[PDB]
Amino acid sequence: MATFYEVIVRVPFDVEEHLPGISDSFVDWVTGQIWELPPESDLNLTLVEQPQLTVADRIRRVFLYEWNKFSKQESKFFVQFEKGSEYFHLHTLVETSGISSMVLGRYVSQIRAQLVKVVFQGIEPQINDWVAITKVKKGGANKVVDSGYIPAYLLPKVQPELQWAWTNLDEYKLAALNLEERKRLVAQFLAES
Amino acid sequence: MATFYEVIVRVPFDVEEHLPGISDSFVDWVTGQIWELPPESDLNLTLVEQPQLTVADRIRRVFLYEWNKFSKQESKFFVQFEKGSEYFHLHTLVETSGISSMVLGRYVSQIRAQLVKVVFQGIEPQINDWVAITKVKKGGANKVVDSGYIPAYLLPKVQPELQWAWTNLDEYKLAALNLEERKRLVAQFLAES
Amino acid sequence: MATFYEVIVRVPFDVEEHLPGISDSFVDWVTGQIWELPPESDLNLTLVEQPQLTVADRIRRVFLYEWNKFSKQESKFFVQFEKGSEYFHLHTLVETSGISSMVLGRYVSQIRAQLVKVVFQGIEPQINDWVAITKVKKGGANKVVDSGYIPAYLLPKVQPELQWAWTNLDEYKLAALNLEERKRLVAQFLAES
Amino acid sequence: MATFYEVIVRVPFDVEEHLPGISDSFVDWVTGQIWELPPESDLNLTLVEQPQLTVADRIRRVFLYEWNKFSKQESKFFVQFEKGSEYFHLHTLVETSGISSMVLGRYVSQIRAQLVKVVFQGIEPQINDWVAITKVKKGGANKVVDSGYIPAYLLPKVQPELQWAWTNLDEYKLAALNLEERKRLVAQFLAES
Amino acid sequence: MATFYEVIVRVPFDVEEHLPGISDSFVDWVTGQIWELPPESDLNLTLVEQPQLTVADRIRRVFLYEWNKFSKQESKFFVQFEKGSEYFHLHTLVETSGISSMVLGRYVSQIRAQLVKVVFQGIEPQINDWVAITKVKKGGANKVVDSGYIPAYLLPKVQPELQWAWTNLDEYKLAALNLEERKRLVAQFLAES
DNA sequence: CGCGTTCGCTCGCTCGCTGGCTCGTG
DNA sequence: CACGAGCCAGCGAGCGAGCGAACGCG
């Protein structure tokens, strides 16, 4: 069946405070990117911090891209951009197929190095553990959950906490940016158990 | 010989008054469960609050199940559902075999938490001490009685006070739901003493 | 709100009687450190055992530093160096934020070991429980108090019992080394309750 | 001031009648121990049951030893070995300093258990209440007297009722084994009141 | 002094029940091995399940051998093959000398993996916990007893419960397969304590 | 005395740490 | 290749609810 690893990445929303030394082309880029809610959505765009989302998106892209290089395939995934009490963080779920838990982290450290070079122009974000692999516990091994995790902990999130979502997993392509669709699946899930 | 611990559980009846926040699936469940008196019984089914019994049963089940997980065995028992002045409460008698009096609670309480998650969908019953271990007194030890306790204090009970009973203890499998069989053993007991 | 843990450290005053084997560089260090009362103070510097205070401070510094490594933040605190019938002892109050009662102990332990290697050049102080966490009672939970604990039990102290104080908590920055400012807050406290 | 607790222990003087099961090494030990009266004494060593005294001494040693483990200090004391109408019994007076009135029991109970293991080789003396804490009354609270209690009730005792005594309390170190010294202080006491 | 760890191993004495998939060469091996009681023995060989003992021995050998690889020495030991109500199980005691309680399990496991490959030709015995280490208590450290444990709990055993014994520990080389030598040391032990 | 309140001791559960493998990269 | 970062099962001090004798006032 489908099993996934979870890698949480914090979004360094502030230029100088998080990325001291970054050029302007960066600050202009994050700005010169306007987000638009697709037809089937129903989210309040006013509650979607666009500047951050623009960064989180790039992150996600490079991540998945660089990841598929290892998995040697089109890894089914489900990214959810969240905004919490501390800071923004991308909840990413990729399918294990192709990456043995014994070597996941040797690869994430390859992607992390890449995010920096591409997204942040070789600048190390001054954020503590901005790319952490979800373990079963401290010193435990890579967690690994099944599809069920999405509607169980990810879907129930609602703005402003919820910001955006992505996913090539058909079963949730609509639940991505639609609080209604979600509420449905989220209910269904709590039922069949 | 056979020794038993006694754990009294108050069975909640008013979904709102006792379990505020509970969904509907629960209220529908307790309802969609009809009780029928087995052939050898002789009780007035009209005096058996089925809605509560439905809950008391589930409690009983999960309690025993979770309990055998500790006793590492098929613990002999005898549960009696009673209805009193204050509220309904399951008189449970499990054999000590395997549970030291010093660590009774830690396990008992491990169960309580379970009942909540399973039976009441993570909702803490607003009832004072709905799961109390019977103490020989104040600051006393966990009271532990022998088989004789059943016919001595449990069997004598008659409707409406008595609502139902369970037991894998052959010696009383018929006295469970039969006021006649009970009156017999109850008398016998009073005799051989 | 702000909640704090309390870690009492007995400061080993007598070099040879408490730290047998310690070099001279240590004894010289504690001596070559002259303390001076800040302008806003009003303490009798004559009653402030500088040699011990020099050590208590080092202790304090390392403690806090190492502590923030755990809390992953600038933990609000309030340390008060006291001198009693038995021996000097730093009353430390750090905010719980970050350290779950369960693990508090394995954290202070690492610190303790750190204090030895850094402050006492790996020499184990021959003092009974020189670093002890406050419990709400033998076998009880790690006592966690709120800001109020400070003016309630710490501020009322006056020389010679009081020796010094530290704190990044603005509300008491002046009460630290000012018996007058103290008496003020100490009074206000006893009133508003 | 100096306050004391009183624990009366019944020294098992009949190897078989009181300690059934004890080995021989014990009976040989008590025998191979000859008592001698120190220079300042004046007691008739002929009236001093050596065999019992040998056990009473061991008892007293272990008692005080184990006790100091609790009081965390050198507890001032005054043990008097007496011989009554029923049996020999050590009158022990230790200073409360360190042992609250709500826990004296649990601490003595531990000592008792220790005396058995060390002194009597895990053999429970068949003597009713051989280790009783002196109370104010039956059902009362743990009694506690001051230094005055020694010359008031303990010193007056004279052979054969008086067998021996001990005490790290200077004021009575001579009155211990000297009927003369005692009679003096005993006199002085009755006067200054 | 001599301290030992205790590793209990069951004995998968069933080709079709415990080792499904095993070849015949194995079943023929355990059979083509006839045990004989040494001269100094006195055991009833009729009560010695030879087929199991043949496996238990191989287990023991590989174990010890592999173990000395870690200990970097000739580890003093004492293995006792026992037959219980559930199944056969080798009581093994190896001297800690060289294996820090921290890596015990990590090593034993390497041994377990070796037993499988060598003794059972890569077939995982379908027995629950067939190679368990004994700990003081849950959450406690690995149990480490001294020489005395042998006569204290191991020697008393008598057929059919006792099946055999090994040991390079001179002091018990004879008590190994002699119920008489055992009874002596077993007695002596109970005395000198 | 009976009976309710202390409060030292018990002992399963938690969760960061140890330290021998594993396996891709330079 | 060997390293050496990432891995993680095994570990066990620390914890804190519970338990129950000891106690001692009404």
TrEMBL record, chains A, B, C, D, E:
Residue numbers binding Zn(2+) 1: Q73, E95
Residues involved in Mg(2+) binding: E82, H89, H91
Residue stretches making up the PV NS1-Nuc domain: 1-193
Any one Gene Ontology molecular-function term assigned to this protein's record: endonuclease activity
Claim: Nuclease is one of the keywords in the record: yes
Transmembrane segments: none
GO BP of this protein: DNA replication; viral genome replication
Coiled coil: none
Residues annotated as catalytic: Y153
Binding site for Zn(2+) 2: E82, H89, H91
Short sequence motif named RCR-2, residue ranges: 89-91
Motif (RCR-3): 153-157
Origin superkingdom: Viruses
Keywords: ATP-binding, Covalent protein-DNA linkage, DNA replication, DNA-binding, Endonuclease, Host nucleus, Hydrolase, Metal-binding, Nuclease, Nucleotide-binding, Zinc
GO cellular component, one term: host cell nucleus
Name the UniProt record assigns to this protein: DNA binding trs helicase
Organism name: adeno-associated virus 5
Full-length numbering of the shown residues: 1 to 193 of 610
